[PDB]
Design a protein around this ligand. Structure first.
Ligand code: MG
Ligand code: MG
Ligand code: MG
Ligand code: MG
Ligand code: MG
Ligand code: MG
Ligand code: MG
Ligand code: MG
Ligand code: MG
Ligand code: MG
Ligand code: MG
Ligand code: MG
Ligand code: MG
Ligand code: MG
Ligand code: MG
Ligand code: MG
Ligand code: MG
Ligand code: MG
Ligand code: MG
Ligand code: MG
Ligand code: MG
Ligand code: MG
Ligand code: MG
Ligand code: MG
Ligand code: MG
Ligand code: MG
Ligand code: MG
Ligand code: MG
Ligand code: MG
Ligand code: MG
Ligand code: MG
Ligand code: MG
Ligand code: MG
Ligand code: MG
Lengths: 106, 62, 62, 119
RNA sequence: GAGUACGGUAGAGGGUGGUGGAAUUUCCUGUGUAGCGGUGAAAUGCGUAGAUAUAGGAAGGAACACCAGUGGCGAAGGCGACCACCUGGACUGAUACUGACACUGAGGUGCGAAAGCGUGGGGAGCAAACAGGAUUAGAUACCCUGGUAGUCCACGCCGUAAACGAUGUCGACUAGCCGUUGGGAUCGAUCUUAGUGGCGCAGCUAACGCGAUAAGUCGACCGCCUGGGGAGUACGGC
């Protein structure tokens, strides 16, 4: 009904709770009747520039079918989280499920 | 912007490569285009003159 | 582009987006690449969005 | 009567239209020797010429040779003349030019520049 | 003719929040020492009470390089960082529907660059007024060093511009050629729409020049002109 393709990258020093964080973030989509369409993790990346005196971060993307309340709660948790460091939301008028780039190399 | 020196290259390829990279980046043009404030009327006037000259040059080939 | 490959582009094909940036980290004008205007607009917005996520550098120096 | 050694430093060129300033530091950015075209004895229009830049750069390099400094990263900043003259002046002193970079600052939009001159 | 219903397309159209990177300035700290800055040449100014340069950290305000285009959108004024939310219009294709419901418009009603005014915030850069240094016969200027209102934000007022295409709105006709922005068809080519540019036949014009985006051929309605000054001034009204 209102699609949202979110890309979120998290601090490296505590980049082990990324599981815990993603499966505690996606607890609101299903209760709202929304379907998860993609959840891709390709973390341990190198930044193009130093964000708050770090050079690496753990990336992730997920596609969400949510409403105003769930979305606003998501950005509330993002803003008040000390590991958010960056975030983006990218509404689309269609649903995408077929990967982003994976590792085309070996 | 930055230049690589390698294979004990002589100190003639180094400067030429540095100059070529600098003009590719156009550092001098940008820094020259900011030594004084250039008001939007002059913006539009200069761009219109550039457009008319560019079209005249394009037509003049035929 | 036109015939078969990718009717639309996004901030995912980092190879294609990297193919359309100068070595100093600036978008290449459409008069050089010879592309269409609509695709040029999509390309510029894709590059800026990808640049915000630190996938691409704002400047080559940083 | 204090002595210390250093190897593989960095030399900065600040080449503005009026004057060019050459300085030498380590990788930590601590001044070792500096020289100015104004100090080289020009004091006027000559101060802007590339030859004054050459003289100042070679003088600073010869002053800094007391510490060894078998390697240099030279970085330039400014659009004034003598942008490349000081590079050759330093190469004449007998250093190893490890790399050459420009650090000319380019504002994206930034503050507005001063009013246009009417001369 | 005008409008409605249904899929799509593009866009700096408008409003409310949040978030980015470059750069300037200021403060703190390390190294280091005699100049920095500026000019046509200088000087004022900043420096051994340790400056400029150089490295690290911090604060804050404003504008949004490259894309960028005879490019786009808007009734005009105007509108360029990115994202979310609210919202107007225009193009585009087929079918169905209403059945003249249209055009213009004295008065009236709103929107309306910049500068300016009121109340309260904010203040990095720039910079009327102003101070000092030059130039000069003089220089209440051009040039240089500083610098306050203002420029920014919220709410309210003000009603003006070479607010210009110096060209009112609406409709219908009239040889062609070369581009370009959106969209369609038929087989890179041909055709067709709605814009945006360059030439040009008739025709028009005092001439310049306009020439399907008329200043040509015609219709409908409105506004305005009647020698130069005095003067868009005086008096009166609002
Ligand atoms: Mg100046
Ligand atoms: Mg300093
Ligand atoms: Mg610093
Ligand atoms: Mg306009
Ligand atoms: Mg104003
Ligand atoms: Mg005011
Ligand atoms: Mg005010
Ligand atoms: Mg006030
Ligand atoms: Mg100030
Ligand atoms: Mg002044
Ligand atoms: Mg000043
Ligand atoms: Mg000031
Ligand atoms: Mg006043
Ligand atoms: Mg305001
Ligand atoms: Mg205008
Ligand atoms: Mg008029
Ligand atoms: Mg007249
Ligand atoms: Mg009108
Ligand atoms: Mg008309
Ligand atoms: Mg109308
Ligand atoms: Mg009409
Ligand atoms: Mg018509
Ligand atoms: Mg013509
Ligand atoms: Mg006439
Ligand atoms: Mg006439
Ligand atoms: Mg008539
Ligand atoms: Mg009539
Ligand atoms: Mg008529
Ligand atoms: Mg009269
Ligand atoms: Mg008379
Ligand atoms: Mg009279
Ligand atoms: Mg009056
Ligand atoms: Mg009278
Ligand atoms: Mg009166």
């Amino acid at each position: 009904m209102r699609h949202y393709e979110i890309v979120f990258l998290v601090h490296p020093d505590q980049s082990e709770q990324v599981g815990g964080m993603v499966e505690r973030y996606t607890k609101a989509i299903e209760e709202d009747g929304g379907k998860i369409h993609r959840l891709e993790d390709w973390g341990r990346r190198q930044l193009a520039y130093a964000i708050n005196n770090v050079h690496k971060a753990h990336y992730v993307l997920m596609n969400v079918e949510c409403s105003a309340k769930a979305l606003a709660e998501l950005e509330d948790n993002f803003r008040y989280n000390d590991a958010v460091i960056r975030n983006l939301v990218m509404r689309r008028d269609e649903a995408v499920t077929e990967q982003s780039e994976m590792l085309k190399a070996e | 912007p930055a230049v690589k020196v390698k294979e004990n290259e002589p100190f003639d390829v180094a400067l030429r490569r540095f100059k070529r990279s600098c003009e590719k980046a156009g550092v001098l043009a940008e820094v020259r285009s900011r030594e004084f404030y250039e008001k939007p009327t002059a913006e539009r006037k200069r761009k219109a003159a550039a457009a008319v000259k560019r079209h005249a040059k394009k037509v003049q080939r035929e | 582009f036109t015939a078969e490959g990718v009717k639309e582009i996004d901030y995912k094909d980092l190879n294609t987006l990297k193919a359309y940036v100068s070595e100093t980290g600036k978008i290449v004008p459409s008069r050089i690449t010879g592309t269409k205007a609509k695709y040029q607009r999509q390309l510029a917005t894709a590059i800026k969005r990808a640049r915000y996520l630190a996938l691409l550098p704002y400047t080559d120096s940083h | 009567k204090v002595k210390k050694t250093v190897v593989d430093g960095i030399a900065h060129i600040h080449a503005s239209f009026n004057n060019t300033i050459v300085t030498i530091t380590d990788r930590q950015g601590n001044a070792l020797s500096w020289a100015t075209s104004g100090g080289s004895g020009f004091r006027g229009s000559r101060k802007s010429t590339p030859f004054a830049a050459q003289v100042a750069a070679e003088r600073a390099g010869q002053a800094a040779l007391e510490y060894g400094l078998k390697n240099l990263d030279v970085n330039v900043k400014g659009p004034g003349p003598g942008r490349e003259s000081a590079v050759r002046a330093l190469n004449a002193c007998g250093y190893k030019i490890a790399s050459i970079t420009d650090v000319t600052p380019i504002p994206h939009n930034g503050c507005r520049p001063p009013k246009k001159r009417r001369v």
